């Protein structure tokens, strides 16, 4: 409604940090300032906001790691930091927290269950599901739709059954990936964040079905329960051509219409 | 570790920051930790890409020759409000410091007593604002007839929002209420 | 699109009671209909229902288009 300027274009680094601190940490409800682990999430979203937007507006600004960004933030605004622990020790406590957080993902099949979409971030080099961590008071389905929509740029709100999934635990981390089919191969896929994932691809479920049986993250630990699903799905589709037949035919002999 | 110190810093830094977006801010009147925005259209609610701390503030419009600045939206949307042009006559402002993207949510507030002076071409297309609260949603009909719905995180502030905006609509500027 | 607005919808409650109406908007938690007719009697211009109370849903017509 009102014309607002874009200070981020011309503003010094200290004041841009101040803007970010107002947006992400200074005014959060008290529930979000309870522990170091809680506030560090707001620090994290603030850092990503700096990299994905602020650095783009002012190229004269430095590239800031999460560690460096945290340093500059606690230096420019010392009143938003009320624990006397070192931020580099607080980061290891943070990682102690993000390892017990559940995580939901999706097995993405085309109509032909030939291809299954997996993603590959820059660092790992081994392909894996699209997945992410749960939020507060969130259905596992809504969670899955949100993170899959984030990493792959695709809304799965009408493609998920709360019953077609499989879950395993690594090291106290409760994983859970659903099983979906009918995704259009044609529609493009892009991460909503430019700097999170390198490549999102799929090859034939068979071309590397048993390349892992030499002995690929996590998918291998659930290939057998997944394999049962895909084969069941193909022959249940061939069945799908038949069940319709029987249904409509029985319906025509009665006053169903 | 002090509560009062941190309160002072919060109000002060909020002023310093909002000032760089709206250089005519004069006093913070109200603030709530979190607010989410929906726009009404197609007889339906539509969640907007605005989320963060919300603040209602007073503005300095004593100068009767200042025209609102001209900023290109640069498109970084499906549906965007009409950015007000023309002379700056808007006593109050509302802002949501957006956590989602760097574009903040903005609403101007003007009393009815100011806008019914059109009598005696106009650069303004202004209609008296409306506000109502129902089912914990704070619905506003703006000066250009856009309809938005603000959902405040903290429940006891929801009513507090309504009662403030309503006041700002019935009376001329006074510097008198929370 | 993600929206199925305009589709003719019929839903059922716990006792096989059926509500028929036009889909106004849908989200994972709630479903809104317009001009809902009720099996046991009564019409309503707008009807809002929660997914908790739904036992089955089926679709009858496409939007006039």
């Amino acid at each position: 409604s009102l014309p607002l300027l874009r200070p981020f274009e011309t503003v010094s680094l200290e004041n841009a940090v101040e803007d970010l601190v107002v947006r992400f940490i200074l005014n959060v409800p008290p529930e979000d300032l309870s522990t170091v682990e809680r506030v560090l999430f707001h620090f994290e979203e603030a850092s990503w906001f700096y990299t994905d937007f602020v650095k783009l507006m002012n190229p004269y600004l430095p590239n800031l790691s999460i560690k460096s960004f945290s340093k500059i933030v606690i230096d420019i605004c010392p009143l938003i930091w009320n624990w006397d622990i070192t931020p580099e020790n607080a980061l290891v406590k943070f990682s102690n927290y993000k390892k017990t957080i559940p995580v939901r993902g999706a097995a993405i099949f085309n109509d032909s269950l030939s291809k299954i979409l997996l993603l590959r971030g820059i660092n790992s080099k081994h392909w894996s599901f699209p997945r992410g961590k749960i939020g507060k008071d969130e259905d596992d389905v809504a969670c899955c739709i949100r993170e899959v929509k984030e990493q792959t740029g695709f809304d799965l709100t009408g493609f998920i059954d709360a019953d077609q999934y499989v879950e395993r635990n690594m090291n106290g981390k409760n994983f859970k990936i659903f099983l979906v089919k009918g995704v259009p191969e044609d529609f493009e896929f892009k991460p909503e964040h430019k700097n999170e994932i390198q490549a999102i691809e799929w090859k034939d479920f068979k071309k590397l079905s048993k390349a892992i049986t030499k002995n690929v993250f996590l998918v291998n630990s659930m290939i057998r329960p997944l394999s049962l699903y895909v084969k069941n799905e193909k022959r249940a589709k061939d069945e799908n051509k038949l069940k319709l037949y029987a249904e409509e035919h029985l319906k025509s002999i009665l006053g169903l219409n | 570790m002090s509560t009062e110190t941190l309160e002072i810093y919060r109000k002060a830094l909020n002023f310093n920051v909002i000032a760089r977006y709206d250089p005519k801010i004069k006093q913070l009147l109200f603030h709530t930790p979190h607010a989410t925005v929906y726009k009404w259209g197609d007889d339906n609610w539509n969640k907007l890409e605005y989320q963060g701390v919300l603040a209602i503030y007073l503005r300095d419009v004593g100068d009767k020759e200042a025209i609102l600045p001209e900023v290109s939206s640069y498109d970084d949307e499906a549906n965007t409000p009409h950015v007000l042009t023309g002379h700056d006559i808007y006593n109050y402002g509302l802002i949501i410091m957006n956590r989602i993207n760097p574009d903040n949510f903005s609403l101007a507030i003007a009393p009815n007593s100011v806008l019914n002076k059109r009598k005696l071409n106009r650069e303004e297309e202004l209609e008296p604002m409306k506000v109502e609260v129902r089912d914990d949603l704070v619905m506003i009909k703006t000066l250009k007839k856009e309809v938005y719905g603000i959902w405040v995180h903290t429940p006891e502030d929801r009513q507090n929002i309504y009662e403030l905006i309503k006041y700002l609509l019935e009376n001329e500027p006074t510097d008198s209420f929370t | 699109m993600l929206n199925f607005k305009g589709y003719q919808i019929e839903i059922e409650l716990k006792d096989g009671k059926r509500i028929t109406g036009t889909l106004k908007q849908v989200s994972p938690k709630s479903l809104t209909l317009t001009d809902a007719v009720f099996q046991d009697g009564g019409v309503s211009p707008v009807f809002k229902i929660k997914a908790d109370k739904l036992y089955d849903l089926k679709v009858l017509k496409l939007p006039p288009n």
Partner: peptide, 26 residues
């Protein structure tokens, strides 16, 4: 270490558009 969640506590608290009241002036 269990029952743990991530992000903002208010991240998914905003109600969905299908549950909101209709304004009385539209």
């Amino acid at each position: 270490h269990s029952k743990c969640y991530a992000g903002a506590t208010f991240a998914t608290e905003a109600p969905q558009v299908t549950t909101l009241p209709k304004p009385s002036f539209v």
